[PDB]
């Protein structure tokens, strides 16, 4: 609903819409889900899209995505959402996101970050200077 939120969500939409055709398909959603360790079936992917597909055209457009994000903001448990997100990044489950783990996640998400880009993400999140990102640092990065 705010213009700042719309801009953030537009950037989020772009990650799913890899071909920039303005729609998210089952292929695109599946690609992202699998990159996050999930193993959905095509039937599941179609059902996921169907839920947010207001016009029944089989894909998600930005307006539909916005409606979905507004719904998420109001119904979802924000604290649990951040904990589950941290666990996605922390592949080995040791409590810290390493630069390698971050790069692996981003690469899976189709973002082929440069060495400099990865270093910047870690440096900015790494408040305590140990070279990795702990949970508190992650929370601070996402909420402030």
């Amino acid at each position: 609903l705010t213009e700042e939120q719309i801009a953030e969500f537009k950037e989020a939409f772009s990650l799913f819409d890899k071909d920039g055709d303005g729609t998210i398909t089952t292929k695109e959603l599946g690609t992202v889900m699998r990159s996050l360790g999930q193993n959905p079936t095509e039937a599941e992917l179609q059902d996921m899209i169907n839920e947010v597909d207001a016009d029944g055209n089989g894909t998600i457009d930005f307006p539909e995505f916005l409606t979905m994000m507004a719904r998420k903001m109001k119904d979802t448990d924000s604290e649990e959402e951040i904990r589950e997100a941290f666990r996605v990044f922390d592949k080995d489950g040791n409590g810290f996101i390493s630069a390698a783990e971050l790069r692996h996640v981003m690469t899976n998400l189709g973002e082929k970050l440069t060495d400099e880009e990865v270093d910047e993400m870690i440096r900015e999140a790494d408040i305590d200077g140990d070279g990795q990102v702990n949970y508190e640092e992650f929370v601070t990065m996402m909420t402030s």
Binding site: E8, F9, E11, A12, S14, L15, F16, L29, V32, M33, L36, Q38, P40, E44, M48, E51, V52, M68, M69, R71, K72, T76, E81, I82, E84, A85, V88, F89, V105, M106, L109, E111, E116, E117, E120, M121, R123, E124, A125, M141, M142
Partner: peptide, 25 residues
């Protein structure tokens, strides 16, 4: 790299997880 890159890129990745989490149930 501009100073604002990190916050925005972290949030984009976070949102990808949040969207999948929300849409799957």
């Amino acid at each position: 790299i501009k100073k604002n890159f990190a916050k925005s890129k972290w949030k984009q990745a976070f949102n990808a997880t949040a969207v999948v989490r929300h849409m799957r149930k």
